[PDB]
């Protein structure tokens, strides 16, 4: 795993690989999250338009890539449930073992550095169950990424939608948690979703609704792997439109629904984020289907 080549290659006039690997880390408990971070090289902006998973195909599960400006520590590793970064850690990866890719679409780059983007990469890698024979060979599983300087025409961001917070009352199967904001920027054009909860979440579903009419962006159970699923055919979001997303818990807190977009470079923002429900009776009128649970 070890066995090196350097943190940057130059590819061309303008572009770069970056490889984000593990120090040569040995989990031992099964179920570790281990995190690291990579400074950016250039201090002018670039745009990330290309990822490669270098994952252990033995022990991996999964890997998250963040962009932040403040990751948690500054060691060579440390373990995530003490944080990715203490700022907002953007997401711009995800992979799972035996998920769909969701490759950035041609034209697409995330842009970082510079005045206002990321500073760094934090790289989370969840291993899963070891075995307690293990010869405490080391990992060095990662993602390698593709940068260039060169503009790209679409820049990709995050919509990340949140509920803020209902109770799941006593004496409750199901509940709702029902998000909802108005557009107001550029048109972005959804192209992934990754959904996530921690109580039994059921099903979690995003729309875009325009003029009355819902169309799916995605739909998930919460509850299996959390990597980014393609949306079929991109969705376009522009000014007027609302974005809503109904989260279904069980009894017997938190819903995340996060919305990988591009938009034209000249009006591009990184992220955006809902944290309220400004159309609440809009959701009597919302598809049956997002009420129909996803074993
Ligand atoms: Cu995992
Ligand atoms: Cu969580
Ligand atoms: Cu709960
Ligand atoms: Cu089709």
Same mark, same amino acid.
């Given at each position: ?135 405490? #060979?080391?990992?060095?599983?990662? !993602? /390698?990424?593709?940068?260039? *300087?060169?503009? %790209?025409?679409?820049?990709? $961001? ?39 909860? #921690?109580?039994?979440?059921?099903? !979690? /579903?995003?729309?875009?609704? *325009?003029?009355? %009419?819902?169309?799916?962006? $995605? ?77």
């Amino acid at each position: 795993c070890l066995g090196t080549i350097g943190p940057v290659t130059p590819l061309d006039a303008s572009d770069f690989a970056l490889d984000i690997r593990m120090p040569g880390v040995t989990p031992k408990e099964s179920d570790t999250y281990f995190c690291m971070s990579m400074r950016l090289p250039v201090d002018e902006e670039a745009f990330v338009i290309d990822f490669k998973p270098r994952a252990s195909m033995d022990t991996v599960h999964h890997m998250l890539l963040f962009g932040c400006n403040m990751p948690s520590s500054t060691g060579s590793y440390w373990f995530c449930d003490e944080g990715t970064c203490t700022d907002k850690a953007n997401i711009l990866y995800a992979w799972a073992r035996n998920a769909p890719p969701t490759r950035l679409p041609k034209g697409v780059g995330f842009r970082v550095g510079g005045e206002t983007g990321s500073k760094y990469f934090v790289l989370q890698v969840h291993y899963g169950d070891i075995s307690a024979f293990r010869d405490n #060979h080391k990992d060095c599983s990662g !993602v /390698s990424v593709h940068l260039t *300087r060169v503009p %790209q025409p679409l820049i990709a $961001g995050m919509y990340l939608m949140m509920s803020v917070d209902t109770v799941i009352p006593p004496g409750e199967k199901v509940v709702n948690a029902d998000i909802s904001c108005q557009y107001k920027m550029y048109p972005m054009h959804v192209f992934a979703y990754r959904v996530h909860t #921690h109580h039994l979440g059921k099903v !979690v /579903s995003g729309y875009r609704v *325009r003029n009355g %009419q819902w169309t799916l962006i $995605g739909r998930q159970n919460p509850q299996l792997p959390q990597a980014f699923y393609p949306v079929e055919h991109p969705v376009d979001v522009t000014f007027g439109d609302i974005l809503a997303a109904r989260c279904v818990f069980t009894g017997e807190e938190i819903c995340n629904l996060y919305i990988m977009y591009y938009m034209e470079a000249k009006y591009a923002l990184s992220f955006m984020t809902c944290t309220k429900n400004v159309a609440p009776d809009m959701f009597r009128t919302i598809p049956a289907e997002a009420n129909i649970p996803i074993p």
